[PDB]
Amino acid sequence: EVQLQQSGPELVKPGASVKISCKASGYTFTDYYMNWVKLSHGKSLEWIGDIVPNNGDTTYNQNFRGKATLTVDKSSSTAYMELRSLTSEDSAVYYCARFSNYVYPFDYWGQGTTLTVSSAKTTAPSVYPLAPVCGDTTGSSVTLGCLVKGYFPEPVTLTWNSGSLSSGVHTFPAILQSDLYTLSSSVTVTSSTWPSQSITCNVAHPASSTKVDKKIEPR
């Protein structure tokens, strides 16, 4: 089936540039325009521009003229977008999408590429075990936590007992704290489950090539 495969997440400092890619397969590349679309918190969905793969002819949203440059390598069926002079408002998810012509719908989309523009450096998380208060908790159930603090950039993956524990889990969206991210997750089990069984929070931070296992021990 038609597939648009975009390149991975990017972290770039303000003022610098970035070039992201969209590799098409499952159809004749020159049969369709390739488009780029921006999804941001400030302005939602915006059309950046399109390009004709056969000859590289481009059409731009004037709002992105001087920001985005579209190119193609038809021999490898890959479209490219280069963003320059990056700022906070450029932090967004960028999609590639095809159409036959601009009056026709975007019938296939890439999976999106997340761009983060920040001066903050790549930083591995500190992982802290959250055990219940030292001395009695009301109820037949018990809630444990995992605090994932001071990492950059997004994302992290957090699991409990390597996926064996999946019910009763809440993983809260990460929040910026002095330009670094902090995340927590809670898991709730019966008192019969913990501490008689081991419960471990598993944290992976791909950007720093980090994996951490933290067993939750009684205080």
Binding site: Y95, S126, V133, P173, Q177
Partner: protein, 213 residues
């Protein structure tokens, strides 16, 4: 440029309801109006093209209608897999423009939060920092208030609150409230308290602990 306006950014309904999402064009776009669905994982798919035409593969409960500048997307009977964000798009004129999007959420009965407080880990204290965490779990509606008290005195600085997306199982919300202090400041106080106030009760839910014990 043509401006596409989706006045409602967030819409709550019950499963099985007839849900209608509106879209407005700043000027005549004929019937060049498409609808896209974005799932929580970021995947985007075409749903409706040319105002009312159903894209291949899309369930028949989806339909569209228009009137030149007024357009609507209708789900005849809302299913759980329909929980997503929906965008309209005009293709009449360059540059192509989108609506701001309408996110669907589910209604359910009110539920009081389950509250748990967590002192800083001994590990974190070794770093010179101290985070006190309060979980407010499985409540409805999303609106909720948390108050932090240190040694009997209210504390507002250093608090960050994060809400989960609506739970895909029981349609409740959860929120984490984190009070972050320095190690030194944390150790200059003893009693730490978090108080949750929700419409389910006039009485707040109070969880506390003492640092020394």
């Amino acid at each position: 440029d043509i401006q596409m306006t989706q006045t409602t950014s967030s819409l709550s309904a019950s499963l099985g309801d007839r849900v209608t999402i509106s879209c407005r064009a700043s000027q005549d776009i004929s019937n060049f109006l498409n609808w896209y669905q974005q799932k929580p994982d970021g995947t985007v798919k075409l749903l409706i093209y040319y105002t009312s035409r159903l894209h291949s593969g899309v369930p028949s409960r989806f339909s569209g209608s228009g009137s030149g500048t007024d357009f609507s997307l209708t789900i005849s009977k809302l299913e759980q897999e329909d929980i997503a964000t929906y965008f309209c798009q005009q293709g009449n004129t360059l540059p192509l423009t989108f609506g701001a999007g309408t996110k669907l959420e589910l209604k359910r009965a009110e539920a009081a939060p389950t509250v748990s407080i967590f002192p800083p880990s001994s590990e974190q204290l070794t770093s010179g920092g101290a985070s006190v965490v309060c979980f407010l779990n499985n409540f409805y509606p999303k609106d909720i208030n948390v108050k932090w008290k240190i040694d009997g005195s209210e504390r507002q600085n250093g608090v960050l609150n994060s809400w989960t997306d609506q739970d895909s199982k029981d349609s409740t919300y959860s929120m984490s409230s984190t009070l972050t202090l320095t190690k030194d400041e944390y150790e200059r106080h003893n009693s730490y308290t978090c108080e949750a106030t929700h419409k389910t009760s006039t009485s707040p839910i109070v969880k506390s602990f003492n640092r020394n014990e």
